[PDB]
Amino acid sequence: SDRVKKIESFTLTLPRPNGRGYLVRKANRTVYPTFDRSVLVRIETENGAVGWGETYGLVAPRATMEIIDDLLADFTIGRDPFDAAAIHDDLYDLMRVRGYTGGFYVDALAAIDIALWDLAGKLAGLPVCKLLGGQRRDRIAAYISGLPEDTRAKRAELAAAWQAKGFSSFKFASPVAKEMEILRERLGPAVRIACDMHWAHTASEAVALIKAMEPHGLWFAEAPVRTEDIDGLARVAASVSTAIAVGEEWRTVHDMVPRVARRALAIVQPEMGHKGITQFMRIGAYAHVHHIKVIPHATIGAGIFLAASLQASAALANVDCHEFQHSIFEPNRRLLVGDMDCLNGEYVVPTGPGLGVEPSKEAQGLLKKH
Amino acid sequence: LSDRVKKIESFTLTLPRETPYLGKPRPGEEPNGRGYLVRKANRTVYPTFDRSVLVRIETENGAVGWGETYGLVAPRATMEIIDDLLADFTIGRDPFDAAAIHDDLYDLMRVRGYTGGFYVDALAAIDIALWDLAGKLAGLPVCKLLGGQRRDRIAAYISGLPEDTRAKRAELAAAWQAKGFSSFKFASPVADDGVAKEMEILRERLGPAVRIACDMHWAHTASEAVALIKAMEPHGLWFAEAPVRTEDIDGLARVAASVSTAIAVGEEWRTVHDMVPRVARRALAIVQPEMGHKGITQFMRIGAYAHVHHIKVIPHATIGAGIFLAASLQASAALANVDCHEFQRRLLVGDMDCLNGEYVVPTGPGLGVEPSKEAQGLLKKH
Amino acid sequence: DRVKKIESFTLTLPRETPYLGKPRPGEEPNGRGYLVRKANRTVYPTFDRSVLVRIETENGAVGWGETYGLVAPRATMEIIDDLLADFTIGRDPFDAAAIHDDLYDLMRVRGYTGGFYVDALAAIDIALWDLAGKLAGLPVCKLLGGQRRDRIAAYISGLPEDTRAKRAELAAAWQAKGFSSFKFASPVADDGVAKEMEILRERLGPAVRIACDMHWAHTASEAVALIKAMEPHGLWFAEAPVRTEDIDGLARVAASVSTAIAVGEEWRTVHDMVPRVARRALAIVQPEMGHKGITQFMRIGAYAHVHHIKVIPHATIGAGIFLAASLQASAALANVDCHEFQHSIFEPNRRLLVGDMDCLNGEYVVPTGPGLGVEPSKEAQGLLKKH
């Protein structure tokens, strides 16, 4: 029965618009870094076992690390990794009554949670999914996310290149019915194609856009309206055949309850980097009870939370497919040791104990301690 | 090694005669030729001796897991479901896949409407042994596999209050209060002078400290249940258990919306699917899962659904060998929102106990309990 | 004049081709002859089997009942022999429905209100009703309110052939035999249900009715897409489009398509029905007599009447006894539009039965009483294995 001894948080800052390297895209008005960055967490136990965790580090990563280093670490040191979920709950209860129930606070918890589960797995010599109810899958279907090219012609080509590599599921970021046609045209009628609509529409607009895409067989519509527009979302889902998909920006199972109450989604798209295993599973288990499909999100990252996501996805009954960030996943290979792969439209669930991946010895060299 | 399930066996085990929940059986309630009798108070069938079904699962290496479900009525049926169907689908699988195994076993028969009753009784016994195994294989208590150990003690409350008069029922209650109990539940069928007089004599006898709940035992319309609840509230009512019939979901929702008291249901359910419609109608404040009907997987799912919807968990308890009791305590030690646990020894080894109004969670790997060598000799094989 | 003796039996007949078609690669039977079908994760036997109950009164009248026995039939018989029999002996068959309730009340508070337990009730119930008809010299439908009908429209269910075109041809054969309503199972639609409707509509013409049984394993979104893909071809009804437990999903599917939504075969009591009609979730109920028994079957029919819902009874694997109950009860119900007809089961099973039940020219001929009007033949009784 080994216990948490030490907790360090880091950034990893890889290169790929204002002074500090921040730009703001103008169809969601959202800020972006012009480089890749995530926050990593290393947790060592008394007997020298090491767990790794990760969360977003795109903007103000020193905030998240502070929360970890100023508050969370002290209430986590001395605890048992096998109480990972109970620990996540106590740490959540620390700040919930002051409205710290999402954003950077839950990010900080995600990173910690993931490493406790990593550590749990290594310590029991099992991959996490075998601590999460069982392994249901060795592989998980993957879909191609975002064609980041200058014109639609140049984007269809890129689609068809990934089709030529054994991928038969695709998402394009709308920010509209033409883009859909050429993608159906170039890719044939067996491939499934989803549209990410990036939040910036009223229910009315989203419905007209969705209805103009349905004649080409729209797989799902993601984020048709703003997060807070629960009414618009429900109105959108009751007005179209097409499955509506949301969840990437949530933090806990509580975020989901209102949306299933209003029967406003067919698909949850949880993002592990934002949630951590405990909450991820809680979202997947809720969706299970309510016959909602799970299609986890993927994003810029070192690949730790990603690995954490595949382990959980392997445990969840309702996981149909998983997002594949090619432009992220490809260059970020060198930074990891382990059997995590994606090829021929399928992620390979890692097998080693824990997450089954670790940052390489050289990736650890690139870390900047907080 | 990757130790897989090699063998599954089913047994019945006859249990020591207790004082039954409702007495003290009246005349005109004699067992028929086959051993079964019917209570007038609930038109419900009861065996002459209490009895449960036990399942023993051995892995390839020789690791042993125990599970247990109800064996009160037609236990051969439940055992046939295991021996004929489920066994051959469990063999070869990994105990660490117990919850996925359960989903697959459930999926075999669900479209034909075998979604509760005897079928889940059968899955529950299997599920519990599988989790026992996972525990032992990993050398960890079950709660350490379910998210962590939140407590090592679970508050208990007294359920058995069977005597002739109110005076004797009160005396009995007080006898348990001196043994360390501060929570009680009485059954309204036993309340011969009305539920109100039952409450009055208990409140004064036990003081304003103790909390006192009522198992209303299903046989009421909503309207009747509300009237009886309101007539109890004055005397400080903890909760009202099973105020209406199970199928009566509107009735339940209506009772819940008409009284301040906490409405508690859950013991006769089988899976988390049974809970959804009740909370969608805001019709309960307390779930009372019964481990012997549900198994660790479903019980945890009911527990986690209750967490999301701010419902308290107060597990049911029934006569048994102690295997599903141990499972229930392991699961209760993991659940955030388990308030307390129902309570109503010579058969198991392990450090499970109930004293001073508290359950003691067993410490070993797995469930923390095993049948003794002697008890193993009492098992009648199917 | 009271019930004196109650015996339970299995009847096991071997199959040339396992139900619903030949297994796909990873669908081989196990040690005991149990395969698992991937499309619906459901377990099937390779042989046909069912449980039959024979009930005898003090004066020597005999009633027959029958329930499912596909899987673990000794469980159902155990319930009947260990518990139910001794609470049924001594009662009057004319109290069939009251008896059904008495026996149901025996176990309800422990949650045994479905599955195998009601299976056991269903079989006793049918034999009880059978007795009542025999004792009174009446067909069962003349104790259930009246005979409204002596023919019932039948529809061809299941088309066991390897290719789309071979299945269409099978349809066409039964069309020539006088049937004009059809249902195909989606676990069989290799090229996808859309192409299946296309060809069936092509092969059979514009006038014929064609439904799709979707076998549960779908989310609402999924089911809506599939239905809408089939609708240009003229869809009669969608059966089991989502999970039984998925009441919200069913409601949303019902609301999202003009196509009639059909459910009911896996329920056990009228109680299962309430939530689904409350949510406006079905146009059609499909009770399966072998799971429900006459009493419950009529409660469900009466509810559909009250709530303006069509009744199209389910038909399945079995000797014909509980199917004969199905025809009797359908005969007494206002809302019965039609009744499923498993040709591939009914035809080879004729040998097992006496009586004048028939199904020909797109019509079930309702047996002319007394009781069920059908019974196991002397040869079928020789094959019965007692529990």
Added chain:
Amino acid sequence: SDRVKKIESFTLTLPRPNGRGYLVRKANRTVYPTFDRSVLVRIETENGAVGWGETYGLVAPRATMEIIDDLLADFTIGRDPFDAAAIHDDLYDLMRVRGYTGGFYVDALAAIDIALWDLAGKLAGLPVCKLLGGQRRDRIAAYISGLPEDTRAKRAELAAAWQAKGFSSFKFASPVAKEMEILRERLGPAVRIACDMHWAHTASEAVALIKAMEPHGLWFAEAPVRTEDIDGLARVAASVSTAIAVGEEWRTVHDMVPRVARRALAIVQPEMGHKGITQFMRIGAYAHVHHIKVIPHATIGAGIFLAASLQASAALANVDCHEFQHSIFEPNRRLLVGDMDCLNGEYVVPTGPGLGVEPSKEAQGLLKKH
């Protein structure tokens, strides 16, 4: 037309249980500092006008300051203070789609917002409330919040001492029907008394507790159940006469919409330190349309956001009363210059332009820059 030139954030750490000075109270399981700390913001314009802002700094204050210094400052420099509300919106839109819609993120925005409004006022030579639609009040009723004494007898005395000072409205923190009786007993039947129930109850428990207090004339019940238990809240409000009060832990008007939809509150209790003027007003304006009373929260602070709160409260039609943190407000006097006072059960709305208060020259000496 002067514009934002420079933005600095600070902590102020006053003295009044683990190593770093954090304890966790066990009826809400919440973490607390054993000292008073808030985060202050100073914003100077091109022509040297100074605005002051403040937000929570109780836990991990360097996180909040980071968010301000790493992201917010750059998108705020060069803007016009008179666009304060529009600026708050653009800054909110920067991070909303990643789930940064509450907690530390909105705190950081509150602090900035408040100073933009301060600056707006000074720059127009008007107190803020005269930029917010008009002044409706010179004074705002105040109620005594929390009797922090060892026994109920010792707490009733303290109540009656504040009654002897012209205060006729009181709140006690439950963490129960006896405490209510002695407070009614000692204080007489004219005084109004509310109970803060600190979130940790199910609907069932909250109703029984409220019903046991109503026989002594309960003014309101605050936070009867957890924030996420919107159902429990609605059930509680439909089961008791007593007005139910919530809102202190919210962040934007969006938090409130679900609760008014379910008709789950009679009173909003916005906390300015958490929200900032823009959102505060939005909450007060929503409540206005829906006939909900506004009773703003008060808390440990230097008194900047407090002053900001009184300015907004002066502008809102539905402000019945305001919370008075005596144990905080009293010692924190020395740190401010301006005409902000509370006496005889009434706050005095400040009159100078802007917030009408500023940290003293010596308080500025105690600031630690980030």
